[PDB]
Amino acid sequence: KVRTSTTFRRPKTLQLSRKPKYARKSVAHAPRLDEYKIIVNPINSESAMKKIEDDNTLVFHVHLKANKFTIKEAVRKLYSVEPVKINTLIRPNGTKKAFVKLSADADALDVANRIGFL
Amino acid sequence: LRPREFARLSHNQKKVQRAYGGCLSANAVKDRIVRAFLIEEQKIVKQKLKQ
Amino acid sequence: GRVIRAQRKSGGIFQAHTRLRKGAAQLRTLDFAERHGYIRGVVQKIIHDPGRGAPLAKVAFRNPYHYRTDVETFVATEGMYTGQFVYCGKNAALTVGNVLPVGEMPEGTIISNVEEKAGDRGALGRSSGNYVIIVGHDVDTGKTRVKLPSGAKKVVPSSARGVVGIVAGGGRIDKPLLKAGRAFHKYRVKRNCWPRTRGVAMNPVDHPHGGGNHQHVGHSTTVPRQSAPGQKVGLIAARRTGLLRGAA
Amino acid sequence: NPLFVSRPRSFGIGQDIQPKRDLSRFVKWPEYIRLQRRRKILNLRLKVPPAIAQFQKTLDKNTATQVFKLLNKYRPETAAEKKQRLVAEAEAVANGKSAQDVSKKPYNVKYGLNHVVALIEAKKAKLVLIASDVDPIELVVFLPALCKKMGVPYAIVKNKARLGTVIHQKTAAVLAVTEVREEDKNELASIVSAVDANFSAKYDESRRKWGGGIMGGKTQALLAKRAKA
RNA sequence: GUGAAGAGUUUCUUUACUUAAUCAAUGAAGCGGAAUUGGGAUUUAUUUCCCAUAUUCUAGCGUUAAAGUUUCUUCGCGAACUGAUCCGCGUUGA
RNA sequence: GAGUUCAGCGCCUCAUGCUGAAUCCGGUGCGCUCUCGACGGCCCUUGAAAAUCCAACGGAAGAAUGGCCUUG
RNA sequence: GGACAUGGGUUAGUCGAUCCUAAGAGAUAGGGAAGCUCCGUAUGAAAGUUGCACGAUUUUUCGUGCCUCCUAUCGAAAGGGAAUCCGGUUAAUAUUCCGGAACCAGAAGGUGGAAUCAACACGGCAACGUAAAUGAAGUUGGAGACGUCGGCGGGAGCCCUGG
Ligand SMILES: [Mg+2]
Ligand SMILES: [Mg+2]
Ligand SMILES: [Mg+2]
Ligand SMILES: [Mg+2]
Ligand SMILES: [Mg+2]
Ligand SMILES: [Mg+2]
Ligand SMILES: [Mg+2]
């Protein structure tokens, strides 16, 4: 029992992980904000139209809690296109707007027509 | 450079190829070498003359 | 009346201004090496300490039990210089700057930063130009008698340590400040104690001296030792007053 | 071979970093360890009243082994042994007589502080073994006086924990022997005589002597130095 | 609380202890005592009357062990003693 | 190749397109604003901290070998 | 019309915040307080994230190990601090969009190169140099990091001047 330090420290002990006898919650919740919540609607103002036909970018009203990662996946899953960059802004009315630029191999005008807000 | 810019240089730009290079000046290192040698030699004679 | 100025000096805006201070000036924790032998340190820096007249010395010592170097902050004695070796312990030599038990130094030696209790790390004779004189030893139940800067004689145990020499920083108080602004700068780095309004310049609500149709105290300014706070102003428990002509 | 050269380290003051020695003496221990160590010291100073000081005078090793040899013969029945006895009484209570017809009188050590106290007051305890480390000591501090008054032999023995093992419990403050089988009568009598010579015969003079009051350590060595000069 | 003297069956003064209580320090870091040791006075000597240390150098360096017998079987930065005497009712001091 | 200045052409013109030139060479400072460099004066005043980044001292650890196709 | 009505409008790895600490605020230990709460901030606490491969096939971060002076957090849109510029564009945003041209940080290791035949490069008297030039623990050093006034010397933009 040799102590070469003048300091007693608490010895390490096992520390088991939880093995509950019952799940506290009976049913796991379905994913909140999957893809139908993330994309709310296309935005079709005049400025958004110019973004479509000049910069190959789509303008979406998106959920306040969506980020650039989930907006990218949602657009890919819903409209089968590949954004190259996503810019985001929160409008003065408190709602979130996303500028979704598509790659040079896709045409934003065609995607807009296919969605049907043109 | 600012402190974090030093993280981008190659090793040899941040030092001198010599003992304590980049930490001691050349004349400081020279004082240390000579001082260490002479002090060690004196410890040798004091040990020899102690017996 | 209201709470007088002396009663408000309990903290708050009257705390010491300590941002610019590098560390307390202390002797070194009394350890095995100092109790039985000596340990050597090297003066690394001699530095100005804001709010203190005397300069401080940063002294580097090797740690006896771990691979590391410990830096100590000492009150510099006059004559000390950077690169000097200082020695602390029972067997240290009687040289300016060394730290020794007062019982190990002869009668008449001049010392500074002397401990009141063995190991308190320095209490007596610390301000610029001050020192303590060894007066005598009593070997039976070892107690050393010393003379303090105030002129008082004190008995410290003959294991309380002291630094050989006088505190550096010389005769600072010999120079007239000459200007309010210089007093301003002296106390700016100390505490909120300057300038001072006279009690008689106040109203009765503010101070026992306040009020009256001339500026005067009214009653005696020598007040008893057991006055309450708020009335303990002026010359407290004064044994005498007036211009002394020959004292001891 | 010539490259293997001795490189001694001095270890004097200010020479080499001290080697890693045992610092247990100077360790700052957690509060509970400090408490249980200084508690033993305080009991060493602080002169102990005789009724408490009579404890810490326990049976010697040899007599203790004989006592536990007898006690281990008369252990109480365990839950397994009790369940077996009950199925026997149940089987024999259907076609034969009562449980008395198929089970015999039990021979076992008595335990339980209130139960043993009653046995002593009724002069049925042949031998009483009082544990030496009953923590609220008042539970047993009267037992030697009660045993002496009733003329029942008694011994103070180490480890309430050792007494508890006999009766299949964690601890037991006190055990009592009431009856012993004929084959153990001579051993009980030899233990009773050995116990009595050390405790019952001591009690008259143990009531006056005080425990503790001893300083030890550095203060005693200073006294020894003071005496030697 | 525990002990010692003194004062004309008692409790008053001082002069002792420490474990209560108080103070201070520290990373509770080497306290106290023995054994080896060499001058010493005892003395046709016996540690019996006595405690003896390792770093003063000049602004260096000092850590993660070497060596020493020697046990596996001596393939090994391999295990232990040791190097680093022994012991403990106290972390140290007031 | 941008920007600027200038000159023309289609002339409802459309995607407002198309076509020509120049954008060059010198000097100045107790100037102004900012800044850097080397200094000087002053103080009983000597003028934050931490995150973070770097260097050294040290020597832990490594396993290529068939005179070469072979690893870290 | 800054009024009224209907619509539109704020895009960033590089700008801030976010990270850091400052005066200070403040849980926790522990002690007060009838209590609301007060004091306290490694404090009289068993206050452990980090350093080793002993098992582990076999080409690698899960089990004990022996270890060591660690630490709550909040507190700066002027302090400290990784990194972006020009040209163009809108009715209304832009160092954020568009065109072009860069930079920083992190991860994995995708090629190429370098050193190593036994070991981790050479040159220079030296100050020191290079495309790379093995470096764990521990320690030490540096940067971050600092007042104010005075004149002197340079640079950039501006100003002025000759074609
Ligand atoms: Mg944004
Ligand atoms: Mg007035
Ligand atoms: Mg008044
Ligand atoms: Mg309006
Ligand atoms: Mg930034
Ligand atoms: Mg913060
Ligand atoms: Mg604008």
Swiss-Prot record, chain A:
Disulfide bonds: none annotated. The modification Phosphoserine is found at residues 45, 47. It comes from the Eukaryota. One of its GO terms (molecular function) is structural constituent of ribosome. It is found in: Cytoplasm. GO terms for biological process: cytoplasmic translation; cytosolic large ribosomal subunit assembly. Its main location: cytoplasm. GO terms for cellular component: cytosol; cytosolic large ribosomal subunit; preribosome. Keywords: Cytoplasm, Phosphoprotein, Ribonucleoprotein, Ribosomal protein, RNA-binding, rRNA-binding. This protein binds to a specific region on the 26S rRNA. Component of the ribosome, a large ribonucleoprotein complex responsible for the synthesis of proteins in the cell. The small ribosomal subunit (SSU) binds messenger RNAs (mRNAs) and translates the encoded message by selecting cognate aminoacyl-transfer RNA (tRNA) molecules. The large subunit (LSU) contains the ribosomal catalytic site termed the peptidyl transferase center (PTC), which catalyzes the formation of peptide bonds, thereby polymerizing the amino acids delivered by tRNAs into a polypeptide chain. Belongs to the universal ribosomal protein uL23 family. There are 2 genes for uL23 in S.pombe. This is Large ribosomal subunit protein uL23A. It comes from Schizosaccharomyces pombe (strain 972 / ATCC 24843) (Fission yeast). The gene is rpl2501. The chain holds residues 24 to 141 of 141 of the full protein.
From Swiss-Prot, chain B:
The modification Phosphotyrosine is found at residue 20. It comes from the Eukaryota. It is found in: Cytoplasm; Nucleus, Nucleolus. Belongs to the eukaryotic ribosomal protein eL34 family. There are 2 genes for eL34 in S.pombe. Component of the ribosome, a large ribonucleoprotein complex responsible for the synthesis of proteins in the cell. The small ribosomal subunit (SSU) binds messenger RNAs (mRNAs) and translates the encoded message by selecting cognate aminoacyl-transfer RNA (tRNA) molecules. The large subunit (LSU) contains the ribosomal catalytic site termed the peptidyl transferase center (PTC), which catalyzes the formation of peptide bonds, thereby polymerizing the amino acids delivered by tRNAs into a polypeptide chain. Component of the large ribosomal subunit (LSU). Mature yeast ribosomes consist of a small (40S) and a large (60S) subunit. The 40S small subunit contains 1 molecule of ribosomal RNA (18S rRNA) and at least 33 different proteins. The large 60S subunit contains 3 rRNA molecules (25S, 5.8S and 5S rRNA) and at least 46 different proteins. This is Large ribosomal subunit protein eL34B. It comes from Schizosaccharomyces pombe (strain 972 / ATCC 24843) (Fission yeast). The lineage of its organism: Eukaryota, Fungi, Dikarya, Ascomycota, Taphrinomycotina. The gene is rpl3402.
Swiss-Prot record, chain C:
Component of the ribosome, a large ribonucleoprotein complex responsible for the synthesis of proteins in the cell. The small ribosomal subunit (SSU) binds messenger RNAs (mRNAs) and translates the encoded message by selecting cognate aminoacyl-transfer RNA (tRNA) molecules. The large subunit (LSU) contains the ribosomal catalytic site termed the peptidyl transferase center (PTC), which catalyzes the formation of peptide bonds, thereby polymerizing the amino acids delivered by tRNAs into a polypeptide chain. There are 3 genes for uL2 in S.pombe. This is Large ribosomal subunit protein uL2C. It comes from Schizosaccharomyces pombe (strain 972 / ATCC 24843). Component of the large ribosomal subunit (LSU). Mature yeast ribosomes consist of a small (40S) and a large (60S) subunit. The 40S small subunit contains 1 molecule of ribosomal RNA (18S rRNA) and at least 33 different proteins. The large 60S subunit contains 3 rRNA molecules (25S, 5.8S and 5S rRNA) and at least 46 different proteins. SMART domains: Ribosomal_L2, Ribosomal_L2_C. One of its GO terms (molecular function) is rRNA binding. It comes from the Eukaryota. Gene3D superfamilies: 2.30.30.30, Nucleic acid-binding proteins, Ribosomal protein L2, domain 3. GO terms for cellular component: cytosol; cytosolic large ribosomal subunit; nucleus. Transmembrane segments: none annotated. One of its GO terms (biological process) is cytoplasmic translation. Its main location: cytoplasm.
Curated annotation (Swiss-Prot), chain D:
It is found in: Cytoplasm. Its main location: cytoplasm. GO terms for biological process: cytoplasmic translation; maturation of LSU-rRNA. The modification Phosphoserine is found at residue 10. Pfam families: Ribosomal_L7Ae. GO terms for molecular function: RNA binding; structural constituent of ribosome. The keyword ATP-binding does not apply. GO terms for cellular component: cytosolic large ribosomal subunit; preribosome. Keywords: Cytoplasm, Phosphoprotein, Ribonucleoprotein, Ribosomal protein. InterPro entries: eL8/uL1-like, Ribosomal_eL30-like_sf, Ribosomal_eL8-like_CS, Ribosomal_eL8/eL30/eS12/Gad45, Ribosomal_eL8/Nhp2, Ribosomal_eL8_euk. Component of the large ribosomal subunit (LSU). Mature yeast ribosomes consist of a small (40S) and a large (60S) subunit. The 40S small subunit contains 1 molecule of ribosomal RNA (18S rRNA) and at least 33 different proteins. The large 60S subunit contains 3 rRNA molecules (25S, 5.8S and 5S rRNA) and at least 46 different proteins. Component of the ribosome, a large ribonucleoprotein complex responsible for the synthesis of proteins in the cell. The small ribosomal subunit (SSU) binds messenger RNAs (mRNAs) and translates the encoded message by selecting cognate aminoacyl-transfer RNA (tRNA) molecules. The large subunit (LSU) contains the ribosomal catalytic site termed the peptidyl transferase center (PTC), which catalyzes the formation of peptide bonds, thereby polymerizing the amino acids delivered by tRNAs into a polypeptide chain. The gene is rpl8.
